[PDB]
Amino acid sequence: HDRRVYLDALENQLKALLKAMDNMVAQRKAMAEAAADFSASLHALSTVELSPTLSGPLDALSELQLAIRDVYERQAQQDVLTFGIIIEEYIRLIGSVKQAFSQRQ
Amino acid sequence: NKFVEQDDWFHDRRVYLDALENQLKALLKAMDNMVAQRKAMAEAAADFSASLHALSTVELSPTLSGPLDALSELQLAIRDVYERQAQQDVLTFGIIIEEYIRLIGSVKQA
Amino acid sequence: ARLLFEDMGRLLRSELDRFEREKVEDFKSGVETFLESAVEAQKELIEKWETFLMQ
Amino acid sequence: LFEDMGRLLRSELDRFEREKVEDFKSGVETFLESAVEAQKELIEKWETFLMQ
């Protein structure tokens, strides 16, 4: 019964961390995906200004949105994915020792 | 100046800032979720901390426990960064986006 | 009427040109506010890391 | 053998826990390195366009 309560507690936690991982990967797609078109929208009006110290900054600001896009999206893959692999690894391992328990029964 | 050029600049501005307004509405929606997730990435990390503590009750061995608590606390710092970040990046962008719409929004009346 | 269209348009150019300059100043301050807070918040994670690296 | 199976189950537990502590520490460390690298890239970018 001790073991049952304790390892049921880890599993619930591990299951909760898993549905967080799914949301966290999903919600990097936009702003990142949005800013990939924010960059083109700004860049577009930057062909319309030609006056050097407004054209120049505006193209840099465009570039800035692309920068935000590249980093924000990369972070699904950086961090969330590292955790999703080890979270998944644990749930299986917990499954497997559920079999060892059964063997004892 | 020339009359064509003045209309050419008109149609350009009007199209551009129509693209931009509708764009800004999409990035704003992106924010609303981001606050909501940072709220609950934190809860994600409360569970995480809890499991570390919940496992320091069922082991105790001297040279494993020490790191294990340190790691719970580490995790609580990350928990905390997640909370922090809603007011860093999410709040900062969300306020300027709304603000750019106000400015486009005034140029629609004009 | 045509005359007014030109000077409304010259105004509009100045208006655009002003507007964009503001939008940078807006983003730049916002960025700075972030830059400062973000450097400390992460500095803090690194300090936390040292404390708990040395165990 | 039922007793020794329970010795084994205990042993597997003590093992299980031990693995868990190390795994998640590496988990957090790999996260740290990444979190700083994401933010550092934006800082380097923010300066580039502060300079315009």
Structure in words:
Chain D: Belongs to the sorting nexin family. Chain D: It is found in: Cytoplasm; Golgi apparatus; Membrane. Chain D: This is Putative vacuolar protein sorting-associated protein. The structure is cut from a larger assembly and holds 2 copies of chain A and 2 copies of chain B. Chain A is mainly α. Chain A has helices at residues 2-26, 32-45, 52-104. Chain B has helices at 3-55, 62-109.
Write a brief structural summary.
The structure is cut from a larger assembly and holds two copies of chain A and two copies of chain B. With 105 residues, chain A is mainly alpha-helical.
Task: Based on the model shown, name its key terms.
part of a larger assembly, 4 chains, A: 105 residues, mainly alpha, B: 110 residues, 92% helix
Termini separation of chain A comes to 13 Å
- What structural class do you assign from the helix and strand content of chain A? mainly alpha
Give the topology string of chain A: H per helix, E per strand.
HHH
Secondary-structure-based class of chain B equals mainly alpha
Morphology of chain A = rod-shaped
Please indicate the percent range of residues of chain A in DSSP E strands (runs of 2 or more). Answer: under 5%
Coarse morphology of chain B: rod-shaped
What is the radius of gyration of chain A?
Answer: 24 Å
Largest interface: B-C, 29 and 28 residues
| Largest sheet features of chain A | none
Measured as a percent range, the helix fraction of chain A is over 70%
Oligomer: part of a larger assembly
Q: Would you list the SSEs of chain B in sequence order as H and E?
A: HH
Protein name (chain C): Putative vacuolar protein sorting-associated protein
Subcellular location (chain C): Cytoplasm; Golgi apparatus; Membrane
Family (chain C): Belongs to the sorting nexin family.
